[PDB]
Amino acid sequence: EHIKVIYFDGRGRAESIRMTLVAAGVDYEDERISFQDWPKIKPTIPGGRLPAVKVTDDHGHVKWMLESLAIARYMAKKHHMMGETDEEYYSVEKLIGQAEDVEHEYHKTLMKPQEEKEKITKEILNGKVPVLFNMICESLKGSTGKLAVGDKVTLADLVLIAVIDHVTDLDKGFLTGKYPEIHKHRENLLASSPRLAKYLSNRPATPF
Amino acid sequence: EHIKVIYFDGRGRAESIRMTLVAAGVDYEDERISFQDWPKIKPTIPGGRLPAVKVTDDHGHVKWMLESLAIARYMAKKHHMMGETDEEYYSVEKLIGQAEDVEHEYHKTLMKPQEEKEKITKEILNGKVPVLFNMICESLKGSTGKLAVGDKVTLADLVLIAVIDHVTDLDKGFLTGKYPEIHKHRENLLASSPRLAKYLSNRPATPF
Numbered sequence: 349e350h351i352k353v354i355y356f357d358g359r360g361r362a363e364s365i366r367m368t369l370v371a372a373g374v375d376y377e378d379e380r381i382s383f384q385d386w387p388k389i390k391p392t393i394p395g396g397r398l399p400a401v402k403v404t405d406d407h408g409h410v411k412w413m414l415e416s417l418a419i420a421r422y423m424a425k426k427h428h429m430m431g432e433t434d435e436e437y438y439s440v441e442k443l444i445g446q447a448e449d450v451e452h453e454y455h456k457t458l459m460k461p462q463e464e465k466e467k468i469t470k471e472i473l474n475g476k477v478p479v480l481f482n483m484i485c486e487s488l489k490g491s492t493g494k495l496a497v498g499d500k501v502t503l504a505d506l507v508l509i510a511v512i513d514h515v516t517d518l519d520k521g522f523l524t525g526k527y528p529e530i531h532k533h534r535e536n537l538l539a540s541s542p543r544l545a546k547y548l549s550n551r552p553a554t555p556f
Numbered sequence: 557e558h559i560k561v562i563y564f565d566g567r568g569r570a571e572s573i574r575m576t577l578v579a580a581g582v583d584y585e586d587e588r589i590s591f592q593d594w595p596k597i598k599p600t601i602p603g604g605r606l607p608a609v610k611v612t613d614d615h616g617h618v619k620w621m622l623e624s625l626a627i628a629r630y631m632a633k634k635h636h637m638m639g640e641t642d643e644e645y646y647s648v649e650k651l652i653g654q655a656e657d658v659e660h661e662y663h664k665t666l667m668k669p670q671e672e673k674e675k676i677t678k679e680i681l682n683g684k685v686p687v688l689f690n691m692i693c694e695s696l697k698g699s700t701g702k703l704a705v706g707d708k709v710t711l712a713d714l715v716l717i718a719v720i721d722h723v724t725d726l727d728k729g730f731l732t733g734k735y736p737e738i739h740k741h742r743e744n745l746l747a748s749s750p751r752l753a754k755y756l757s758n759r760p761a762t763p764f
């Protein structure tokens with residue numbers, strides 16, 4: 349396959365797909381569309397929303413895939429990153445759901461005036477986000493190994509770090525001197541996946 | 557197992573779990589907590605949020621499961637309702653993600669004054685919801701069989717009908733004389749699963 353991941357110039361909903369490919373050691377083309385260009389390109393993407401993944405073989409030819417975490421789960425399943433037992437699969441999905449709930453809170457701050465955004469940010473960071481972080485902590489403590497689920501990288505690990513990055517977008521100091529399990533998880537992940545370590549260190553800085 | 561599904565007296569986030577058990581032919585206890593009682597019960601549920609599923613064997617004894625769609629996916633996997641091939645698994649997850657996006661829009665109307673709720677409802681039903689329904693329609697048309705993914709019931713079918721029910725909560729007339737693929741899907745599902753047909757006909761009416 350030639351794999352092309354098409355998204356805006358940000359982490360956003362595409363980051364789980366990028367990280368999955370990176371962790372699995374799969375080469376892909378990272379196609380990033382400027383907001384100025386999007387209205388021109390939107391008519392050409394099946395469904396008209398991003399991310400979309402265009403997969404080209406050489407036999408038939410083009411296949412389009414939509415729906416970010418459907419794509420990520422499929423790729424993760426192909427590469428043995430959705431758990432090794434049914435119980436691990438549940439644990440992966442549980443942490444994904446918890447992480448997605450944090451993402452839902454973060455999403456409230458997007459496209460808001462630089463005044464209301466500050467109000468929403470304070471509300472979610474002093475309200476639901478700490479509650480979800482406590483659940484995430486409990487989920488991590490429940491692991492049988494050094495990563496989110498056992499000792500092998502799963503999609504849960506990647507979803508988790510992507511959402512934590514959105515939290516630190518809102519408040520760079522949110523985890524400073526706090527949440528040792530979250531820090532340890534990231535350290536353990538980076539030690540476990542040099543491909544991901546390299547990718548994260550070379551990743552362009554984006555606002556979302 | 558004795559399985560107890562614990563939720564508020566509504567469909568909400570528990571409905572995917574209930575429907576999965578029903579479709580799979582698994583008996584469970586449906587424990588519904590009144591809002592008046594919740595502050596009293598909240599301290600006793602691991603994580604303090606619903607739904608939670610309490611599973612009792614007779615050997616060890618109690619296991620708690622959290623995170624609605626993690627629970628639903630695990631139960632669906634155990635009962636061969638997550639697709640028969642990797643490509644079907646992707647299709648299941650794709651329709652789940654699309655359906656969940658409709659649910660996200662619906663969620664905006666909850667706990668709002670009976671004036672702003674009417675304003676949000678109009679906005680989402682004339683905006684993003686029709687766009688998502690078109691995607692859902694395309695996903696259904698893509699099926700190799702009579703249901704959402706092939707000819708066998710999957711978790712995608714159940715998530716889909718649960719979210720459509722939330723749409724018709726907002727506007728009872730939203731699908732009247734429209735969206736023939738959505739109607740056909742429901743008819744096909746009910747013909748395919750007499751257990752679900754019976755369950756839906758006997759289900760108590762709830763506001764969410």
Ligand SMILES: N[C@H](CCC(=O)N[C@@H](CS)C(=O)NCC(=O)O)C(=O)O
Nearest residue numbers: 361396397398399415416417653657
């Ligand atoms: N369920 C989603 C939603 C994708 C989505 O909401 N895409 C947005 C950007 S993250 C978009 O393409 N909006 C621009 C537009 O619709 O014109 C997914 O995760 O793939």
Ligand SMILES: N[C@H](CCC(=O)N[C@@H](CS)C(=O)NCC(=O)O)C(=O)O
Nearest residue numbers: 445449569604605606607623624625
């Ligand atoms: N990711 C969720 C969230 C569960 C959730 O938001 N629960 C709400 C009701 S749907 C709740 O228990 N709120 C009452 C409270 O937190 O005190 C799941 O699907 O299980």
